Design a protein around this ligand. Structure first.
Ligand SMILES: OC[C@@H]1[C@@H](O)[C@H](O)[C@@H](O)[C@@H]1NCC1CCCCC1
Length: 469
């Protein structure tokens, strides 16, 4: 019975928490010296790409309301909190010569300090998609190898300013999503590929993302880790991939190829220093090569890996060039009119709790990761502006979703997966990228009509009751 899952089913030192990213919650987009990110620009110049034409100028105003969020996190009672630093908040021009923003540094110090004063461990992501527009404009951001050294300078600033208090770092969050939705489908910032080339740019972007991650890891391990004694890893997008027909060799290979193109793309480089065999074969000359020094730097470049999980799909074989077609699979939601899971508030999120278990087991089996966190797992409310607060806060479906997924994490730990922590996504309803504000992922409700007033959902209350202390 999943409804009974609690902290006493986990080791005493198992880490529970919640999450956010800077662009999605902070606001103060031009306050306290922040420079623009590619997401400010995308939402400003291309509001048609956003459901409701909205943007993160104000988001849910966590920049000004940080003390209120810390009070929420204290009452919630979980050990940890995962957030990202906005690169163009601390470095408005992305590179050092664009200026060092002291006030932006003070904001993160205030947040870290409030978190530690309340017994909450900060888990901090350097890059959650908000590339400085200055670097995007000067040289194409992640399209250019120039991004590697600038990300390193930025990482080093953060390690220096915060590393005495921050002990868990992640270089990147979902570089998969960043690369694919930014450069293959062109639906997320910087909006390319839909002037862009979905057949070449996602592979260059991912290549530079990997090299940025490698160089920041090397920087931390060689220059900060002995003095600061923290850990550094990375968070990856995952989706469970199931063969459509369990007895079809062709579907078994296709589901594995889908895993290769989503997770393997990033996991194999940090495991053996090269891309998956299947990507080499299907992408060919369009997949960049790592130099021997790059391979050596990438291999084993983490102290832990976080996985982000939402949903699952059946997979079968497919029937000029583009990342989406290179995978050579067709996704399927149903077997004989039975969907793999029911929909959440979003039609792409089919609830399949076993998938987080299979994705954990798969990651240990294939990549032999010694330390794994679930860095994101969560579900969105059905869209409804007709509900009063007593009704909107009864998130039965999210409560069941978390219970079921956390139960599956425990199952994966019984299978031998060394999971060290689990972070629900998200702490607050927030800006859901291309979907804007209508998609609510929070365990804490936001009232968009009244200065983003916070109110806990039943899921938050159950997390506190079941997992506090
Ligand atoms: O959309 C849910 C969260 C975001 O709010 C967060 O910024 C990000 O890390 C994660 N991506 C979901 C993931 C991305 C594309 C395929 C669907 C599922």
């Amino acid at each position: 019975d999943a409804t009974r899952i609690s902290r006493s089913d986990f080791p005493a030192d198992f880490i529970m928490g919640t999450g956010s990213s800077a662009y999605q919650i902070e606001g103060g987009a031009r306050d306290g010296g922040r420079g623009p990110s590619i997401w400010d620009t995308f939402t400003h110049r291309r509001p048609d790409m956003i459901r409701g034409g909205t943007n993160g100028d104000v988001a849910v105003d966590s920049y000004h309301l940080y003390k209120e969020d810390v009070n929420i996190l204290k009452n919630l009672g979980l050990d940890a909190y995962r957030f990202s630093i906005s690169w163009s908040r601390v470095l408005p021009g992305g590179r050092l010569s664009g200026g060092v923003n002291k006030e932006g540094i003070n904001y993160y110090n205030n947040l870290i300090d409030g978190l530690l004063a309340n017994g909450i461990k900060p888990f901090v992501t350097l890059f959650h998609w908000d590339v400085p527009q200055a670097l995007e404009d000067e040289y194409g951001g992640f399209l250019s190898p120039r991004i590697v050294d600038d990300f390193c300078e930025y990482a080093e600033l953060c390690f220096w300013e915060f590393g005495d208090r921050v002990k868990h770092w992640m270089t990147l969050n979902e570089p998969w999503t960043f690369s694919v939705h930014g450069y293959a489908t062109g639906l997320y910032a910087p909006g390319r590929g839909r002037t862009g080339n979905p057949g070449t740019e996602p592979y260059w972007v991912t290549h530079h993302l990997l090299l940025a991650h490698a160089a920041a890891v090397e920087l931390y391990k060689n220059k900060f880790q002995r003095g600061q004694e923290g850990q550094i890893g990375i968070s990856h997008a995952t989706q469970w991939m199931e063969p459509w027909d369990e007895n079809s060799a062709s579907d078994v290979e296709a589901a594995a190829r889908a895993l290769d193109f989503m997770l393997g793309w990033f996991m194999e480089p940090i495991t053996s220093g090269d891309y998956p065999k299947s990507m080499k074969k299907f992408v060919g000359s369009r997949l960049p090569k790592f130099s021997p020094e790059q391979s050596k730097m990438l291999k084993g470049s983490y102290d832990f890996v976080g996985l982000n999980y939402y949903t699952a799909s059946y997979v079968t074989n497919a029937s000029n060039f583009s990342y989406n077609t290179d995978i050579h699979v067709t996704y399927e939601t149903d077997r004989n009119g039975v969907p793999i899971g029911p929909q959440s508030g979003s039609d792409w999120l089919l609830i399949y709790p076993e998938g987080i278990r299979k994705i954990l087991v798969y990651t240990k089996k294939t990549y032999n990761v010694p330390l794994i966190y679930v860095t994101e797992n969560g579900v969105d409310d059905v869209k409804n502006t007709n509900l009063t607060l007593s009704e909107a806060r009864k998130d039965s479906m999210r409560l069941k979703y978390l219970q079921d997924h956390i139960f599956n994490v425990r199952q994966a730990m019984n299978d031998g997966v060394n999971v060290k922590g689990y972070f629900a996504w998200s702490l607050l309803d927030n800006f859901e990228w291309g979907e804007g504000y209508g998609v609510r992922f929070g365990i804490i409700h936001i009232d968009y009509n009244d200065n983003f007033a916070r109110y806990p959902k039943d899921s938050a209350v159950w997390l506190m009751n079941s997992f506090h202390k």
